[PDB]
Design a protein around this ligand. Structure first.
Ligand SMILES: [Zn+2]
Ligand SMILES: [Zn+2]
Ligand SMILES: [Zn+2]
Lengths: 66, 258, 49, 115, 50, 47
């Protein structure tokens, strides 16, 4: 529902990289290049950004008030 | 009938990871230092979260869980603080803990991004990693929601929980050529040469070596950002030395009592 | 139904998600679904032995 | 619901001894050291150090059960060298070695930074 | 006195307006209901975009 | 002196509801309303 804070297997902080990864994908980069541009060497930490689903948006659509 | 004279040589020192080499030491010592790197390294981290008003879309415990995982720079504070369990006072005293406060409320129309930068610490030096590269996203708030809480941090080590795990990933590897045959390749040609392999590209693996002991352990400790890597190594060495010292004292007392 | 051809905006505002397949009744506040039963086709001659 | 707390793996409980010596009877000069609230970290290195010592005929540790935080170290020396002093010597030299390693690592770092 | 659109009844208000327009056979009432529904939809779209 | 404040379903407006009273929002008028968080010492361990 939200990007984790750390890679389950490794432990490297990955939570602070979701917005950057999205920006890099948006401008021109491709995933395979954006991932190493952020500095994710081990394939264990890449699954965090590739596989992660972003449901928090759908959750925010149900605004309590206004 | 005594110990050995290990040597050390750093190959790559940065503010993010350290790659060094240890020579003339036993495998047990190397792997033990590794396990101390991962498990027994003092570090600060959030451990007590009191939530006063949480109107976000995530659970109450989700916020505390995430806040448990945000690293905190402890370069010179972990050594000074004392474990809360061994403190001699009630409530989280500043001498034995670091307090945190967070109070955000999405008023404008655009969705907020409550990042670690909202964690206003009382102490100057104990802050999340934002000094010098976005910040750890905690939760997203929408107009009308709010999140008020305060949490305290305390010293622990990875063995108790992962939050106290300073190292991202320790790359430990010795004898890059399979000279001691500790592993048997069914088809050696099919395997790629190790980064530390001195062997040329023709031969697949070094010839067997009967009278050969493991030396030249290669380390690639990688700090998560809480402590500096060389600081992790120094703390691990000091902690292991202390554990041995305590054990020796206990054994001495036991023998004397007998 | 009240959500016949309704945009995802209104669905979200009605505390419902656009992904819900639907096609299930609400009795006493429980989602009831009818299992498709099967039987022998009618008006067809079968010769069993 | 019955998950034990995380502090039971390293913190001693009131009344439990950190280290207990128990002489064995099957062979002369053989003792079993029992350590509470420890793991392979603090047993494997001692095992190796005891192996280095030539006067130590047998040396080995074990973990009775992973869920239990306890280890047993068995040591058997020549008749003229009690296992207690073997253990003390092993720990003393191991501490000396780690201190020397720390000093060398520190000097290597301080030289690596602009040097 | 309290205006209707505020704040969570946008979809309910739109459905009510559509139902009233469908029920009403008058042309002027139908046009007014359609215009009100279109205005409500536009306001909701603007709020969502913001 | 606690009148057991409630939160309207869709208005998200507070209401003062006492015993032996209908459950409705002060305005519009709906039949759904949730309670407000306790005031107790909700303390979690970030474990
Ligand atoms: Zn990973
Ligand atoms: Zn204190
Ligand atoms: Zn009402």
């Amino acid at each position: 529902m939200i990007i984790p804070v750390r890679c389950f297997t490794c432990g490297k902080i990955v939570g602070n990289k979701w917005e950057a990864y999205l920006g890099l994908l948006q401008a021109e980069y491709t995933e395979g290049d954006a991932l190493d541009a952020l500095g994710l060497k081990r394939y264990c930490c890449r699954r965090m950004l590739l596989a992660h689903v972003d449901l928090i948006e759908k959750l925010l659509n149900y605004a309590p008030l206004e | 009938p005594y110990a050995n004279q290990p040597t050390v040589r750093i190959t790559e020192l940065t503010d993010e990871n350290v790659k060094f080499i240890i020579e003339n030491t036993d495998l047990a010592v190397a792997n033990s230092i590794r396990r101390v790197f991962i498990a027994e390294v003092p570090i600060i981290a959030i451990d007590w979260v009191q939530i006063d008003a949480n109107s976000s879309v995530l659970h109450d415990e989700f916020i505390a869980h995430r806040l448990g995982l945000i690293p905190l720079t402890s370069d010179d504070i972990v050594d000074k603080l004392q474990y809360s369990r061994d403190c001699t006072c009630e409530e989280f005293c500043p001498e034995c803990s670091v307090e945190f406060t967070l109070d955000v409320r999405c008023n404008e129309d655009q969705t907020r991004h409550v990042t670690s930068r909202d964690l206003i610490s009382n102490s100057p030096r104990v802050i999340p990693v934002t000094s010098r590269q976005d910040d750890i996203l905690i939760v997203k708030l929408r107009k009308g929601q709010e999140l008020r809480l305060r949490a305290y941090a305390k010293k622990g080590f990875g063995k108790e929980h992962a939050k106290w795990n300073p190292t991202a990933g320790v790359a430990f590897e010795y004898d890059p050529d399979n000279a001691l045959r500790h592993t048997v390749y069914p088809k050696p040609e099919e395997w790629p040469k190790s980064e530390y392999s001195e062997l040329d590209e023709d031969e697949s693996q070094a010839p067997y070596d009967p009278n050969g002991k493991p030396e030249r352990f290669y380390y690639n400790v990688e700090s998560c950002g809480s402590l500096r890597p060389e600081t992790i190594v120094l703390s691990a060495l000091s902690g292991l030395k202390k554990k041995l010292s305590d054990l020796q004292t206990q054994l001495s007392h036991e023998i004397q009592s007998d | 139904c009240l959500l016949n051809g309704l945009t995802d905006r209104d669905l979200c505002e009605l505390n419902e998600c656009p992904l819900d397949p639907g096609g299930y009744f609400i009795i006493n506040g429980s989602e009831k679904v009818l299992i498709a039963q099967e039987k022998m086709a009618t008006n067809t001659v079968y010769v069993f032995a | 619901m019955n998950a034990p707390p995380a502090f039971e793996s390293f913190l001693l409980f009131e009344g439990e001894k950190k280290i207990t010596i128990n002489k064995d009877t099957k062979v002369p000069n053989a003792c079993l050291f029992t350590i509470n609230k420890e793991d392979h970290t603090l047993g494997n290195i001692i095992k190796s150090q005891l192996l280095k010592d030539p006067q130590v005929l047998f040396a080995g540790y074990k973990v009775p059960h992973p869920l239990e935080h306890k280890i047993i170290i068995r040591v058997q020396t020549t008749p003229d060298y009690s296992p207690q002093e073997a253990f003390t010597n092993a720990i003393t030299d191991l501490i000396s070695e780690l201190s020397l390693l720390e000093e060398r690592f520190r000097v290597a770092i301080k030289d690596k930074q602009e040097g | 006195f309290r205006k209707a659109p505020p704040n969570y009844a946008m979809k309910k208000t739109q459905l009510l307006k559509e139902k009233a327009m469908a029920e009403d056979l008058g042309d002027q009432d139908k046009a007014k209901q359609i215009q009100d529904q279109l205005n409500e939809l536009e306001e909701r779209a603007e709020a969502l975009d913001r | 002196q606690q009148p057991m404040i409630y939160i309207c379903g869709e208005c998200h407006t507070e209401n003062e509801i006492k015993s032996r009273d209908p459950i409705r929002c002060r305005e519009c008028g709906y039949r759904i309303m949730y309670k407000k968080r306790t005031k107790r010492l909700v303390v979690f361990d970030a474990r």
